[PDB]
Design a protein around this ligand. Structure first.
Ligand SMILES: *[C@@H]1O[C@H](CO)[C@@H](O[C@@H]2O[C@H](CO)[C@@H](O[C@@H]3O[C@H](CO[C@H]4O[C@H](CO[C@H]5O[C@H](CO)[C@@H](O)[C@H](O)[C@@H]5O)[C@@H](O)[C@H](O[C@H]5O[C@H](CO)[C@@H](O)[C@H](O)[C@@H]5O)[C@@H]4O)[C@@H](O)[C@H](O[C@H]4O[C@H](CO)[C@@H](O)[C@H](O)[C@@H]4O)[C@@H]3O)[C@H](O)[C@H]2NC(C)=O)[C@H](O)[C@H]1NC(C)=O
Ligand SMILES: *[C@@H]1O[C@H](CO)[C@@H](O[C@@H]2O[C@H](CO)[C@@H](O[C@@H]3O[C@H](CO[C@H]4O[C@H](CO)[C@@H](O)[C@H](O)[C@@H]4O)[C@@H](O)[C@H](O)[C@@H]3O)[C@H](O)[C@H]2NC(C)=O)[C@H](O)[C@H]1NC(C)=O
Ligand SMILES: *[C@@H]1O[C@H](CO)[C@@H](O[C@@H]2O[C@H](CO)[C@@H](O)[C@H](O)[C@H]2NC(C)=O)[C@H](O)[C@H]1NC(C)=O
Ligand SMILES: *[C@@H]1O[C@H](CO)[C@@H](O[C@@H]2O[C@H](CO)[C@@H](O)[C@H](O)[C@H]2NC(C)=O)[C@H](O)[C@H]1NC(C)=O
Ligand SMILES: *[C@@H]1O[C@H](CO)[C@@H](O[C@@H]2O[C@H](CO)[C@@H](O)[C@H](O)[C@H]2NC(C)=O)[C@H](O)[C@H]1NC(C)=O
Ligand SMILES: *[C@@H]1O[C@H](CO)[C@@H](O[C@@H]2O[C@H](CO)[C@@H](O)[C@H](O)[C@H]2NC(C)=O)[C@H](O)[C@H]1NC(C)=O
Ligand SMILES: *[C@@H]1O[C@H](CO)[C@@H](O)[C@H](O)[C@H]1NC(C)=O
Ligand SMILES: *[C@@H]1O[C@H](CO)[C@@H](O)[C@H](O)[C@H]1NC(C)=O
Ligand SMILES: *[C@@H]1O[C@H](CO)[C@@H](O)[C@H](O)[C@H]1NC(C)=O
Ligand SMILES: *[C@@H]1O[C@H](CO)[C@@H](O)[C@H](O)[C@H]1NC(C)=O
Ligand SMILES: [Ca+2]
Ligand SMILES: [Ca+2]
Ligand SMILES: [Ca+2]
Ligand SMILES: [Ca+2]
Ligand SMILES: [Ca+2]
Ligand SMILES: [Ca+2]
Ligand SMILES: [Mg+2]
Lengths: 448, 427, 6
């Protein structure tokens, strides 16, 4: 309730670039505090690349300029230079670079989940996906494509789309979700920044990272599960190594489920199942302590959840589930459920920790409903944490102050909070609105 | 009681606070004038003095149920219009009579998966047009049939996008045609021979991921109206496949984020916006299938029965059948589904104003009486059978001072009952 | 029988 909603800061990008599809805080120290915005449809100065996508750096102080991860066009096949006509070995056009943007310390991870390549054998069109990792404040740039392996095509990791979802741990470990691996069984892959740089050799296209953790191929009964559709991190195993939370929205007869994996050996620890078929339970996941007991609690979104009005009419509203952790573990059934009230509102499409917004000792949460509102522009709900868990009523409701237009705004489809952008002691919030190519920054004012 | 505890300062306030309250006008009564209808006479209040406005029920349109007639000339529900004046907290109940028509036309649209796993199936359907039309001849005197095909969204990663695989998504020997979202091969017609002719020309296709994009097609069939040629009769949509289904959210893998708009986008009988709009959600299909009165028959293989069994529970007016190896049993499947769908009625009402509530009580054959959510439906309704519903409406506020109106209708029919509401707020 | 295949 202490976010400055009457006058937020609006960042604007190029038209049609989907500027705001992904948002993130960047701070190599404190002096260079900045906002990162992904624009997956942005045109770039890369030669021969159409709408390669871009990431914009927006320093906070007094605007936005694109970061140059890769200035090169699509590389050429080795043996094509023998034949009559050079041909690309990869396809960076329409790769959606910047679909996911995450940062940890002076490192920035930007992913292109629709990046595809030919392979150097039989011609394919494998969307293996790729990520670029900047380190030490843009002094070294690395490419990281863990799914670009010996095992090609849908049967292997050819359609992995690695980087479709991503996140950093507290130690800076990279965690990637690739929902397309092994006939869309899905896959989690992870490697330390040291491990990635140690085996980085751009002359060879295939990934050779040693010590890399990754989930294993299962039987065909698990196909089309989209494991790794969304990802988050949090401690759930009782040690000091953050664990991996992964959404599996089409698992178990498309009732969907969320899984927690051991950050040490990626082995499965817990499962949480949805309550309705094709509700997309696991569309979005988050981990944060919402009741100040020191144990990270789980939040899951199911934006297609369909309930009935009192007069008997069905309606798509969406629903969020909260699982409170306790010293013995976690219960499979939710402690609390939050239900949207806007038809086709898609409540629970995005979730982000807010830290402690009002400094009352309990961390708070923001939940997006990209198509909520009286004009379907989108809405963001702030829910207060407390000793009994998250509150069932919002403490604040954020909406765009600009008028609706010919196209949806998608306001609230991308969220990021839990960090202090201006150093006033109160955490702040970034809201994406890529439909109109805008990102909004809400600041926490000291209030009562 | 709550009549005295209301402290009614006028005749008006007394009415909206409790249905059991009356107002004394005598001036010989020793806010105490607002008491129970019994508590006033016990205190010496003349009945000619106790003002007590009461709700009422007035039928306005009441064509009797029917027993050579056009579909619009057939009455299956009565009354068709009535007025209910509502006292706050006092329910008004009225009877709804439903009768299943003797002979009613049928539109059946056959929407078929033409992905590669449906290769052997397409060969058996070569005579489905004339064979089905023969069977329906002993069910209805007016039958029409249509045919549509679907595969998948025409974008990465759902299809392979190499130039060769775009021309032929299958192997070299296999002469598969290019992948396509949805094709309206044949609009509804009474010529079964044309169905055989055009279905016999269609070519099997293919794609990459096992779940297919039939939901995009179902949506189009549901909302495209005249392009399909739906009549205001029994509308059957047979959905034949051997795979699971994509739904909203799956589109995001291909960068498709716009929700389905539920609008018609056929150009040259081809769906042209599969690359632009995401797959519909089940809830979105529920809305549009119901709105356009489409009754869905899911003719799916044995292994996907569990999935489509759950889908049927979510979709009103839908049925599931086990499709044989290559659609050899599809006709009997359709007949069994129709008999099941037509023998059950389900009532739905429009949105009510806040403070207003509705309740159903069904009275079916063999003395089977339903209440709660079961009060909305009757089953085992044979041809010519009559069932009745007792429908109560109660207002607990004073919504507006203007009259409200909403419709009650059985799913799958244009016929409806217009219920006009009027609220007693003053004496 | 994985993907779109019999
Ligand atoms: C949350 O929910 C999820 C999903 O709902 C659930 O995950 C599933 O859990 C079940 C049960 O654990 C899994 O099913 C089992 O899978 C076992 C893994 O098989 C691996 O290892 C096999 C043996 O060798 C390998 O690995 C070691 C190193 O670890 C190595 O040294 C060896 O050399 C060797 O490589 C291996 O054979 C197997 O690979 C085979 O199968 C795959 C997939 O088909 C195939 O690609 C390979 O070619 C090969 O044929 C794999 O690498 C498995 O051992 C286990 O076996 C039992 O069942 C079979 C059949 O029923 C019995 O015959 C056998 O005797 C055992 O009783 C079983 O199959 C399932 O795969 C998981 N699914 C997913 C998606 O993860 C979580 O557990 C849930 N979590 C919680 C907390 O509840
Ligand atoms: C990124 O740069 C792109 C250019 O490389 C931008 O795309 C261009 O957008 C403009 C405006 O919408 C288009 O101009 C119109 O073109 C139509 C017909 O064009 C058709 O032919 C081209 C030939 O290649 C084809 O590519 C198109 O898809 C069309 O089928 C004219 O009738 C109009 O009058 C108008 O001139 C360009 O055609 C289009 N170019 C390409 C290569 O697509 C894109 O908008 C930029 N996006 C961002 C976010 O910066
Ligand atoms: C997460 O995985 C780690 C590593 O396997 C587990 O810790 C190991 O426990 C085994 C028990 O046999 C020991 O042999 C290893 O030495 C341990 N390794 C490490 C790095 O701790 C840990 O128990 C797992 N966590 C949970 C909650 O199961
Ligand atoms: C897979 O989903 C089913 C239901 O879709 C889960 O079972 C249901 O389990 C809950 C308890 O977890 C019960 O309340 C329901 O009544 C169950 N339904 C039926 C029909 O039995 C099942 O646990 C899920 N399994 C996994 C591994 O996710
Ligand atoms: C089938 O019935 C529907 C509903 O009665 C008809 O749609 C209505 O058509 C009238 C034409 O005067 C319009 O004024 C209404 O607004 C329409 N209402 C709805 C809900 O569509 C439709 O025209 C009929 N079609 C056929 C072929 O009989
Ligand atoms: C269901 O409701 C019907 C009302 O139509 C009940 O049948 C009535 O039963 C009473 C005696 O119990 C008779 O006096 C009436 O004449 C009957 N109605 C008719 C239309 O014949 C029936 O008993 C109810 N059954 C259940 C199980 O509730
Ligand atoms: C990082 O480099 C940028 C220029 O790319 C510069 O503006 C900034 O001050 C540097 N910050 C640190 C902490 O080195
Ligand atoms: C259809 O299925 C039958 C088995 O019932 C099989 O013998 C026949 O070869 C199949 N035909 C095609 C064209 O797949
Ligand atoms: C594929 O079939 C068409 C007609 O269906 C035919 O004209 C064409 O020659 C065939 N192609 C091959 C390679 O057999
Ligand atoms: C339907 O009703 C008839 C006659 O009323 C009865 O013989 C039959 O058993 C009923 N069927 C079911 C499934 O209730
Ligand atoms: Ca841990
Ligand atoms: Ca906690
Ligand atoms: Ca707080
Ligand atoms: Ca701040
Ligand atoms: Ca088949
Ligand atoms: Ca498919
Ligand atoms: Mg298929």
């Amino acid at each position: 309730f202490n976010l400055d909603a009457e006058a937020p800061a609006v960042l604007s990008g190029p038209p049609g670039s989907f500027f705001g599809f992904s948002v993130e805080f960047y701070r190599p120290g404190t002096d260079g505090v900045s906002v990162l915005v992904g624009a997956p449809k942005a045109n770039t100065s890369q030669p021969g690349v159409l709408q390669g996508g871009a990431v914009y750096l927006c320093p906070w102080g007094a605007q936005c300029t694109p970061i140059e991860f890769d200035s090169k066009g699509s590389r050429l096949l080795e043996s094509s230079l023998s034949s009559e006509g050079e041909e690309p070995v990869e396809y960076k056009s329409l790769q959606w670079f910047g679909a996911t943007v995450r940062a940890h310390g002076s490192s920035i991870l930007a992913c292109a989940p629709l990046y595809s390549w030919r392979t150097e054998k039989e011609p394919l069109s494998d969307p293996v996906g790729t990520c670029y990792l900047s380190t030490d404040n843009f002094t070294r740039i690395l490419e990281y494509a863990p799914c670009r392996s010996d095992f090609s095509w849908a049967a292997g990791q050819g359609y992995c789309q690695g980087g479709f979802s991503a996140e950093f741990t507290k130690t800076g470990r990279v965690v990637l979700g690739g929902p397309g691996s092994y006939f869309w069984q899905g896959q989690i892959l992870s490697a330390t920044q040291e491990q990635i740089a140690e085996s980085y050799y751009p002359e060879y296209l295939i990934n050779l990272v040693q010590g890399q953790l990754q989930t294993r191929q299962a039987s065909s009964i698990y196909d089309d599960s989209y494991l790794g559709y969304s990802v988050a991190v949090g401690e759930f195993s009782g040690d000091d190594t953050e664990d991996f939370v992964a959404g599996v929205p089409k698992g178990n007869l498309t009732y969907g489920y969320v899984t927690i994996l051991n950050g040490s050996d990626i082995r499965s620890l817990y499962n949480f199942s949805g309550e309705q078929m094709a509700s997309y339970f696991g569309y979005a996941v988050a981990a944060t302590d919402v009741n100040g007991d020191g144990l990270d609690d789980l939040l899951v979104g199911a934006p297609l959840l369909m309930d009935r009005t009192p007069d008997g009419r069905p309606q798509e509203v969406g629903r969020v589930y909260v699982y409170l952790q306790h010293p013995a573990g976690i219960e499979p059934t939710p402690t609390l459920t939050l239900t949207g009230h806007d038809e086709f509102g898609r409540f629970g499409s995005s979730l982000t920790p807010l830290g402690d917004l009002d400094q009352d000792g309990y961390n708070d949460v923001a939940i997006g409903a990209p198509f909520g509102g009286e004009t379907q522009q989108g809405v963001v709900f702030v829910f207060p944490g407390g000793p009994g868990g998250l509150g069932s009523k919002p403490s604040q409701v954020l909406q765009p102050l600009w008028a609706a237009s010919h196209t949806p705004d998608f306001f609230g489809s991308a969220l990021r909070g839990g960090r202090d952008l201006d150093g006033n002691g109160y955490p702040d919030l970034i809201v994406g609105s890529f439909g109109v190519d805008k990102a909004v920054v809400y600041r926490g004012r000291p209030v009562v | 009681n709550r009549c005295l505890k209301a402290n009614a300062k006028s005749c008006g306030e007394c009415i909206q606070a409790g249905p059991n309250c009356g107002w004394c006008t005598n001036s010989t009564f020793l806010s105490a004038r607002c008491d129970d209808l019994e508590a006033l006479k016990k205190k010496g209040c003349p009945p000619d003095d106790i003002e007590n406005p009461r709700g009422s029920k007035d039928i306005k349109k009441n064509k009797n149920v029917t027993n050579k007639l056009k579909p619009e000339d057939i009455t299956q529900i009565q009354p068709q219009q009535l007025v209910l004046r509502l006292r706050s907290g006092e329910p008004q109940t009225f009877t709804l009579k439903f009768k299943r028509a003797e002979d009613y036309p049928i539109d059946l649209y056959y929407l078929m998966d033409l992905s590669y796993s449906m290769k052997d199936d397409l060969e058996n359907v070569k005579s489905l047009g004339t064979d089905l039309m023969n069977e329906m001849r002993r069910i209805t005197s007016d039958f029409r049939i249509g045919f549509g095909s679907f595969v998948e969204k025409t974008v990465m990663p759902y299809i392979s996008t190499t130039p060769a695989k775009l021309r032929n998504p299958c192997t070299s020997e296999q002469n598969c045609t290019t992948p396509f979202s949805y094709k309206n091969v044949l609009s509804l017609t009474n010529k079964g021979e044309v169905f055989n002719e055009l279905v016999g020309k269609q070519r099997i296709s293919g794609n990459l991921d096992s779940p297919e994009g039939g939901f995009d097609a179902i949506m189009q069939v549901a909302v495209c109206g005249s392009l399909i040629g739906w009549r205001n009769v029994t509308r059957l949509l047979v959905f034949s496949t051997d795979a699971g289904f994509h739904f909203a959210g799956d589109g995001k893998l291909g960068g498709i984020v716009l929700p389905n708009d539920g609008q018609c986008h056929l150009e040259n009988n081809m769906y042209t916006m599969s690359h632009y709009y995401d797959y519909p959600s089940i809830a979105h299909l529920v809305q549009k299938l119901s709105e356009n009165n489409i009754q869905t028959i899911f003719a799916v293989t044995e292994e996907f029965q569990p999935v489509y069994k759950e889908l049927k529970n979510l979709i009103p007016k839908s049925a599931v059948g086990t499709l044989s190896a290559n659609s050899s049993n599809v006709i009997q499947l359709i007949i069994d589904a129709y008999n099941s769908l037509s023998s059950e009625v389900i009532l739905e009402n429009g949105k009510l104003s806040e403070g207003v509530t509705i309740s159903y009580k069904s009275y079916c054959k063999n003395g089977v009486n339903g209440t709660g959510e079961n009060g909305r439906k009757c089953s085992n309704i044979s041809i010519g059978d009559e069932v009745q519903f007792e429908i109560s409406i109660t207002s607990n506020k004073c919504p507006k001072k203007d009259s409200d109106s909403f419709k009650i209708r059985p799913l799958g029919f244009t016929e409806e009952v217009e219920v006009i509401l009027q609220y007693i707020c003053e004496c | 029988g994985r993907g779109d295949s019999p």
